[PDB]
Amino acid sequence: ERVYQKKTQLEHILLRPDTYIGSVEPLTQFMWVYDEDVGMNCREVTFVPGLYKIFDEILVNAADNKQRDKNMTCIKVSIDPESNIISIWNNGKGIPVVEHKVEKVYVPALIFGQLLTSSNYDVTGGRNGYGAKLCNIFSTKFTVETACKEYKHSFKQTWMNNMMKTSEAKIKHFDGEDYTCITFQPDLSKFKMEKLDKDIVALMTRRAYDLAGSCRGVKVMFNGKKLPVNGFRSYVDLYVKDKLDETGVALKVIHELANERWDVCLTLSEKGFQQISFVNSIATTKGGRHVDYVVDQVVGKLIEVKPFQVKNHIWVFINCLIENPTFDSQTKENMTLQPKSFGSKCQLSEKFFKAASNCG
Amino acid sequence: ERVYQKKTQLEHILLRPDTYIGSVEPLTQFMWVYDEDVGMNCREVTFVPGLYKIFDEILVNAADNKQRDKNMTCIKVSIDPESNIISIWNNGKGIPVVEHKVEKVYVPALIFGQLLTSSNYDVTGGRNGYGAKLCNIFSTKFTVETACKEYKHSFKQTWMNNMMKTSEAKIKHFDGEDYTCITFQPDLSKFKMEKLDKDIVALMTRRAYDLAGSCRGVKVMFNGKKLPVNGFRSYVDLYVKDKLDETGVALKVIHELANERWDVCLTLSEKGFQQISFVNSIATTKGGRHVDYVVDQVVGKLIEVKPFQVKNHIWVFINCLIENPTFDSQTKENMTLQPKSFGSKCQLSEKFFKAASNCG
Ligand SMILES: Nc1ncnc2c1ncn2[C@@H]1O[C@H](COP(=O)(O)OP(=O)(O)O)[C@@H](O)[C@H]1O
Ligand SMILES: Nc1ncnc2c1ncn2[C@@H]1O[C@H](COP(=O)(O)OP(=O)(O)O)[C@@H](O)[C@H]1O
Ligand SMILES: [Mg+2]
Ligand SMILES: [Mg+2]
């Protein structure tokens, strides 16, 4: 009665945040971040993993639209801590503003407003069709505007109090250029925070750079300002800038775009195996089977001393594209799909291995 | 239309197994297992993490009933690979066989047959109210019998084809002793297996010992046979049996039951920091904040050489009880709750630290 209960999905996510967005409790560790005044750096940061995940969900959704429509050119990220607002703007193709014939609602409502809703069910980050709704549910306020020329209409609706309230949809006729814009005020009470502080903002800032880094052919703007990153190699520069090798010489980097789904720089490590890596624009900070795949080859080749001893002098950077990825966790820092399932190959030329001989 | 879709919860779990039970793909690593002929040993094992999780769900549910009713004395685990059947029997209090007034179904149906159903919503392993249903959904066949004297009835129902079919409930009047018995034939096609092989059976076998180890005041029988484990210390013996120290002498173990929720043995390690540990009878093989809590103290004390250097000569075994645990993953190998949230303290006497001086 009171003992034996059944929860709604909504009620349940609220009852079991952990289970959906990750820990809603503080976690302190060394992380790569973009601080305002220093830029890219590795330091002890303290933040709530579940806060990072509602943001990264929305930012990855923009990234995915580029794989959906390659005519997409730009993403604007804006973070206003004092007002507690975050907004993510992309162009290319919007979301059809049309009544969905089966579910009898406008498609943007359906996919931002109801659970288990995705265009990716039947090489995005998106797959499970929670994500947007999770952000919505962990926001005091959550606004969707989208406009799709092909369907001749623009859409705008606002949800409130963790997706429990909602304005009706504002629907107008539209012939402009497509955009989707997601604006949310996360619910800081659920993460036990006053404000978005230096630590979460520097992490969030790092994801916009990551996206410049990860997402081919898309300008990224942070707070109205273009990010000077064009190419994976220039993103990697952010990290290797004023790194020293053993002889007080700055690090050589080796680049090879192996094909459109594998993009790889390599260099020396002087504090053991490290890795920066992305699958479908998602920062796999713990790593994955995609990292293992690649490293294998390299260790494999280099040797021509056990493998593991060489892993300790490598710093690998991978931007890759994988069909239907899986992960250890809800914050996805490690990616668990098998190589025989990735849907593409990484084959690195001799040139790369030979260039690679010639740093430490 | 075809593009923008909404899945049922059922459809979705089937569509996204990974997301619920973990990888449904082979994973190979060194693991602790009970092989038939050697007993407890650490070796490269290959198995499907999602197979282990439907089993461990049911076996943990029995363990939890002991915290629900301490008059529970016994759990029978039976694994029949040739027939593809597994059955888990416990006594103590059954499940009320009564129509649930709100949901208008017998309670056992509701809690084994519908999702987001739990008696733990408002110090079990159970919390999220998926688990049983997940097992049901990854079984070609799944049978529940329960009997609760207080409600004057016994219950029996069978589900089939991943919880898509079901006999009506067999309901009879009952005045005997309470039992709950869960019998399932996992769906091997979803894990891409022919049979349950040596590797999954030795893992499953190890969990029954773990339960003898973890679960105070409950006999455990594997395949009709009592397990000679009474006490945490005797379980620990399984691992330290014919271990050597540095001078070819078998390992000393130090025991302290700090209180009813912390139970701790310690010894030497000669292949670096290791840990065997349980929260609410769940094998946290990766570890957790509960492991960190304890180790802290010990390192802390011992020193009276950096902390980390001592971690490399410890082998810690923890059986603990935690209020409302969280985990990195769906297979729960690491547990993520903060110490200030555990709901109890571990304070170890001087005797323990002083005894602990006197091995390596
Ligand atoms: N920025 C965006 N541009 C276009 N469509 C989007 C965008 N964000 C979300 N969507 C659509 O709404 C759906 C729901 O997003 P989400 O909840 O993340 O599901 P998924 O895990 O499939 O990404 C997506 O599958 C996608 O079709
Ligand atoms: N062996 C058992 N004995 C008694 N009740 C059980 C048993 N197994 C499951 N139940 C009940 O059915 C519910 C559903 O089990 P499960 O799906 O694991 O939910 P939970 O995560 O709460 O354990 C449990 O909350 C518990 O109340
Ligand atoms: Mg998404
Ligand atoms: Mg359970």
Author numbering:
A (entry chain A), B (entry chain A): 47 to 168, 174 to 355, 367 to 422
The authors write:
Human topoisomerase II beta (TOP2B) modulates DNA topology using energy from ATP hydrolysis. The N-terminal half of the ATPase domain contains the ATP-binding site and is directly involved in clamp closure, undergoing dimerization upon ATP binding. The C-terminal half of the ATPase domain forms the transducer domain, which connects the ATPase domain to the enzyme core (Oestergaard et al., 2004). A heart-shaped dimer is formed with a central cavity that is 31 Å high and 23 Å wide, the dimensions of which cannot easily accommodate a DNA duplex. Each TOP2B ATPase protomer folds into two discrete structural modules: the N-terminal GHKL domain and the C-terminal transducer domain (colored yellow and orange respectively in Figure 2A).
The structure was solved to 2.6 Å by molecular replacement using the TOP2B:AMPPNP structure as a search model. The final ADP-bound model contains residues 47–422 with missing loops between residues 169 and 173 and 356 and 366, where the K loop resides. The ADP structure is composed of a virtually unchanged GHKL domain compared with the AMPPNP structure, with the nucleotide and most of the active-site residues in the same conformation. The adenine ring, ribose sugar, and α phosphate of ADP make the same set of residue contacts as in the AMPPNP complex, despite the sugar pucker differing. As the γ phosphate is lost during ATP hydrolysis, R178 and N179, which were previously bound to the γ phosphate of AMPPNP, instead bind to the β phosphate of ADP. The γ phosphate-binding site is now occupied by a sulfate ion present in the crystallization condition (0.2 M ammonium sulfate), as is observed in TOP2A (Wei et al., 2005; Stanger et al., 2014). Thus, our ADP structure represents the post-hydrolysis state with the sulfate group mimicking the ATP hydrolysis product, Pi. The transducer domain of the ADP monomer opens up toward the C terminus of the protein (represented by dashed box in 4A), signifying the relaxed conformation. Moreover, during the reorganization of the transducer domain, the QTK loop is shifted away from the ATP-binding site (represented by dashed box in Figures 4B), preventing Q392 and K394 from making contacts with the nucleotide. Specifically, the side chain of Q392 moves by 3.8 Å and K394 moves by 2.5 Å.
